[PDB]
Each structure stands twice: as C-alpha cells, then as structure tokens.
Symmetry: C2
Subunit: 396 residues, 2 copies
C-alpha cells in the first residue's frame, strides 16, 4: 500500500537537511579547521556513528529490493505481518540520526559558545542514540525497537537459546560492523586514561610515554574485542550442531569461523614479537600471510557456493549461476562476484591492522579508508543470501 | 488524486534545503556582512524575487484550501478538467526559486573570485528566471508556463480583448505586485545610468550629490510605472461596461480604481512643490488626505459588501456574514475582516511612500516592511472571493 505523503515528505526533508549539512561541514573542515591540531581522535570517535547511519540506509535499500523482486522475506524472518517497517521508515530514521551526527560534528568544529570546550557533544549524541534504542514509551516505532532489543538479548546469549534465522543474520551483520565495537572501546580508553577531564581546551599534542596506551594491546584489550563477533557466531553454530546433529554444514562452519580466531591470535603474537624484536619475528610474518590466505581462500569458497548458491551443476544457459534466478539481469550477479573477491581481502587486511598496530602512521588511515567498504560488501551479500534462502524454501 | 511519492520527496528536499540556506544566510548576514558598505541596493534588487517566491507559495496554500474546502476553481477559471496543477507543484516551484535566490544572495555576499567582482549574480538570477518562464521546450510543466505567458499577454493589452474571469483575476493579483515593477525599474536605472559597468567595487560613498539619481522622480516615469496596473484594470472595467451595457457595477468599480490616479498625482505634486519650496505647498497636502479617505473608504465597501457579499440583509442567524458559508470557524471570517480593514490603509501608505520619495531615511525601511503584507492580504482575499463566485454560479 502507498505510504501517506507525510512519511515521504519527512524522508525528503531529512535527506535535504543532511545533504546541505554535509556540504557545509566539508567547507568548514577545508577552510576553518586548522591542520596543526591532530583531528584523528575525532574521526576515530565519529566513525561508529557514520557506519551505523550508512548501514541503516543500506538496509532500507535491501528491503526495497526485496519487496520489488518478490522475495517473501516476512515469512523468512518470521515477522509480524500486520506491523512491519518498509524502506521509508528506515530512510527517515537514518536521516534523522545523520542530521544529529552532522550537528554534533559541526558544533565540535566551531564550538559556538560554552565553558567546557568540545568533549560533551560525542557523549551527548551517543547517549541520545542509546536512549532512542531503549526508550520505554510507546512512541517512535515501539514494536520494532522492542523486537530488536529482544533479538539482541537472544544473540548475545545465543549458546543457551535456540538459534533462528534473524539470530544468525544479525550475528553476521555484527561481524561486519565490528568497527563500531573497537571504536567504542577506544573511546572508553581515551575518556578514562588520557583526557585531562579536570582541565580546559581538550586535545593537545602527546609527547609523554604513557600516551598511546590505547593504541597498544596492553594484555588483551585489543584482540578480544576484534574476535568477539567471531566467538558469538562460532558458538551459535556449535549449538546449532548440538541440537540438530547434522554433520556437513554445521561442523564445516566452525572451521571457517575459527580461522579468524587463528589469524587474530597470530597477529597479536606478531605484535608482541615486534615488541620483543625476536630474530624469528620475520619468519612469523610468513605464517600470518599463510593464515591470511587460509583465511580468505576459505570464506571465499563459502561465499559463492554455500551462501549465494552459485556454480550449480544444472546451470544450463545461466553461465556460472544457478538454474533459477529471480533478479532480471545477470550483470549484477557478475559484478557482485567480481567485487566480493576484491573486497574480502581488504576486509581481512583491515581486521589485521586494526588490532595488530602495524603501519604506525598509515594504519589508522588504512582503517578509515576501508572501513566503509566491508559494509558495502555485506550490503551486496544480503541480496543474494536472502534470495538463495527463498529459493531453498521454495524447493522444499 | 494521490500524487507520486517522488513529488512529495522533492517538495521535502527543497523545503529542507531552503530552511538551512535561510538559516546560514541569516548567520552570515549578522556575522560576515560588514556594515560600512551601504546594503540597500541589495534589498531593492532582491525584494522582487522574494515577493515573487512568497506569492507563489501563498498561491499554493490558496489552491490547497480551495480543493479541500469545496471551492470548485476548475469550472470558474475554465481550466481543463483532466490536466490541473496541484498545490505540491506550486510548492516545488516556490522552493526551487527560493533555493536559487538564496544561493545568489549568498554569492553576492561572498563572491569568492571572478573577473567581474560581485555584480553578475543578480542579472544571472533574473535571467535564469526569465529563461525558465520563456523556455520553449516541452518540459517543466510545459502547460503552466505557456498558459501564464498567454494570460500575461492578454492582460497587458487589456482594452482590446474580451474579458473573462482569469483575465480580471490576474489583473487584480498584479494590482498587488507593483513593487516588482518598481524594483525592476530601479535595477534597470542603476545598471544603465549610474553604475560604472567597466569598473570594480560597487560601494562608492553615498554622501556625494551624484548618488541617488535613480531615487529621484523629476523625470516623472516612477509615478506612471506605479499606476500602470491601475490603468490596466481601469481600462479593462471600462471595456467591460462598454461590452455589457450595465452602468452600476462596472462603472462604480472603475471609479474605485480611478481614485488612485488622483492619489498618486497629488502625492507627486506635493513632492515637486516641496522640493521647490513653493509658498502654499501644504495646500497641496489638504486635498490629498481627502483623496486618502475617499479612496480607502471606497475600496473597503467594495471588499466587504460587493467582493465578498458580507453584511447581507437576508443573512438570518449568521449576523454580519452571508446566509450560507462553507468554512467552519467564524473566527476565520472575523479575523479576515479585521486584517483586511487594517491592511487596506497600509497598502495605500506604501504606494504613496514608494511613489513620492518622502521620508528619506525611513521610507525604504517602511516600504520593505509593508511589502510582504498586501500580498498576504490578497492571499486572504482569494478564499472568500472564489467562494462567493462559486455560490453565485451554483445559485445562477
């Protein structure tokens, strides 16, 4: 059914304010923001909000495509039929949050008037976001936030509860968005140990030895945060095997989800080896690279054959595809297959350097540049995973 | 007729961009625009565009009101029943012109760099508006622009063509937009006579005797371009009387529009005598105030009694209104009566102030404040005029 003009009008209003705010923010950054002050902490803090906004927009795009293409995704997610969110609500929420993020960033830039210089705005934005998430009144999409909160509870306690479709789906979407988790941990570390709260001005050049502790792994504060979603999904799959006792897919997935654990622990060992400067440290490079290959070359084989279900023996006229395809043009299929193999390697590299403390001056730049790319990889992955599930359900 | 969601999205986008541009323009004006330079030429240049944008938005509100309340404008305007322009398109055009106007004003405020320092943006904006109006392509509401141009041609040569509803309605609307003509004339004079076109800057001191040449009226075309709309409507009503052979309504109406001729000529005569310091100059004042009252107290009885059909003897239970009404709240009618009575005086005050060059310091300011009020008065007027026309058509 066509949505009322109020919803669409709100979507457009928020989109336009968002666009103009982005342009004026770029102009202010290029012109007003002096380069001498380091601005890396600001980006490291606001990257999480940007990623969340982008993910919400992209999810709106996927649900649009799902309704257009004929995928019966309400039954697949086992949603409530009479109360569902279409693309416009997701667009409106994303635009609203983007307006707030842009306003907070602009305030941090200019600092119009206050006595505490700039370190209230990020806390305020994140506090309002979490308040929106857990607001107990019956307004602003109460059902959807209730369902999401219950499902988050189920996912983070998954080794105990039964696992369903939306459980592991949001488990993966958390696996791609781990950047927000490490950003939150770094923000807590910075606000706890580094910043002079009982002072003025704020950020200043760091010359002391104690500076840069949050850049270090200390004991495990960096690697464990990285592998947390891997642990969640690993334990979910183990439990699914335990209830089901079906060998092939459930036991195979454990290895795929444990390869990242092996890669992360090897990266941490290499970090401590550069700290020690051992003679064999260079040799430890090779193993990492090996387990880099063994990582990517694993999940790739899983992506095309098991996730998306390509390379069917009954391909027929559909070259390098399955017998039955719902999307009209094979061009998107081939484009996605091409770009996924490119983006997976960058994702693994990003995970490695965001916890290994490598490339000291360019590592965070690397993290920034390929942070909003695995999200697009997952945005592509969603379409084909859900359509494969729809045809699998249709077959049986 | 549910419009497509894209139209509503564009309306929202343009509204949001317009709001943010207005806010940043206000901020830049209070902060960045230094006050040493005389700025009144900028206001006298951009006032025409502002008034046109405002009039277009208010017409959108008017047509939405007619459609919702039951005022059947399609039959009376003689528009094609199957091709009509809804209020959302009027909102779109108003927002588009407003965004362009805001961008041009901001550029004139800043003017990053060029070969021509700052005075290309006004001609650029007005030329864009004209090329939009007279574009011969079959795009951008290819019926509305052509219909408006044809009606403008019919109105501007009124004493020759037959007179229908749309002709006199647009003539009445034009009666409230003489400020556009005054602004256009002043801009032409400034860019033709005084401005050093082959030069730079544009902030020459105003204390020189050479300044304010276009503010003078000794040549006497200011008054004529002022009363041009009055002449158009007067000769139109005279032609209507000639064609109809009915003295009462058309002839009294013609006298009504005739009074402003005496208004303007007496105002100009006082101005000339006062500059010459003629002994009995205040004598020329006296008749003026008389021709003040006999003007306003004239048009009022046309607006309240004949235009709207109020104060009817056969009203019945609805005291001080007509017998039948369509709008629910009498507070609307009473507030409209009070506001019409209040603003009918300010309209003639503004006319005399603009065409007489009195109050050398406060005249421009008071004209600026009273300009966006008689257009709102006309906006209020259309409601009840079209409702009375619909009642007349239904009854007979």
């Amino acid at each position: 059914q066509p949505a009322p003009a109020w919803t669409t009008f709100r979507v457009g209003l928020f989109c336009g304010i968002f666009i103009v705010l982005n342009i004026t923010l770029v102009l202010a950054a290029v012109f007003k923001l002096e380069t001498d002050r380091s601005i890396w902490p600001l980006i490291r803090i606001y990257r999480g909000g940007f990623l969340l906004i982008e993910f919400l927009f992209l999810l709106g795009i996927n649900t649009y495509g799902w309704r257009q293409a004929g995928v019966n995704h309400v039954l697949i997610f086992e949603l409530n039929p009479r109360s569902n969110l279409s693309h416009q609500h997701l667009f409106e929420i994303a635009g609203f949050l983007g307006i707030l993020w842009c306003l907070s960033l602009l305030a941090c830039f200019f600092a119009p008037i206050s006595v505490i210089p700039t370190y209230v705005y990020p806390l305020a934005l994140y506090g309002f976001m979490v308040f929106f998430l857990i607001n107990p009144t019956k307004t602003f999409y109460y059902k959807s936030r209730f369902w999401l909160l219950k499902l988050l509870f189920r996912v983070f306690t998954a080794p105990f509860h039964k696992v369903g479709f939306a459980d592991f789906w949001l488990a993966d979407q958390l696996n791609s968005l781990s950047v927000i988790l490490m950003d939150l941990e770094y923000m807590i570390c910075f606000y706890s140990l580094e910043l002079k709260w009982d002072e003025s001005k704020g950020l200043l050049p760091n010359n002391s030895e104690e500076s840069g502790i949050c850049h270090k792994y200390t004991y495990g504060v960096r690697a464990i945060v990285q592998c947390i979603p891997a642990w969640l999904r690993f334990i979910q799959c183990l439990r699914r095997y335990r209830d089901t006792k079906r060998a092939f897919p459930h036991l195979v997935n454990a290895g795929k989800y444990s390869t990242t654990f092996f890669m992360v622990t090897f990266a941490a060992l290499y970090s401590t080896h550069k700290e020690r400067g051992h003679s064999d440290t260079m040799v430890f490079f090779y193993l990492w690279i090996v387990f880099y290959i063994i990582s990517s070359c694993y999940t790739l084989i899983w992506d095309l054959k098991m996730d998306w279900g390509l390379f069917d023996k009954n391909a027929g006229e559909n070259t390098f595809l399955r017998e039955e395809i719902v999307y009209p043009q094979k061009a998107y299929y081939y484009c996605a297959i091409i770009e996924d193999v490119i983006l997976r390697f960058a994702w693994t590299i990003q995970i490695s350097i965001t916890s290994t403390t490598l490339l000291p001056h360019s590592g965070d730049i690397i993290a920034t540049v390929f942070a909003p790319l695995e999200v697009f990889r997952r945005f592509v992955w969603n379409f084909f995973r859900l359509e494969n599930e729809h045809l699998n359900n249709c077959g049986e």
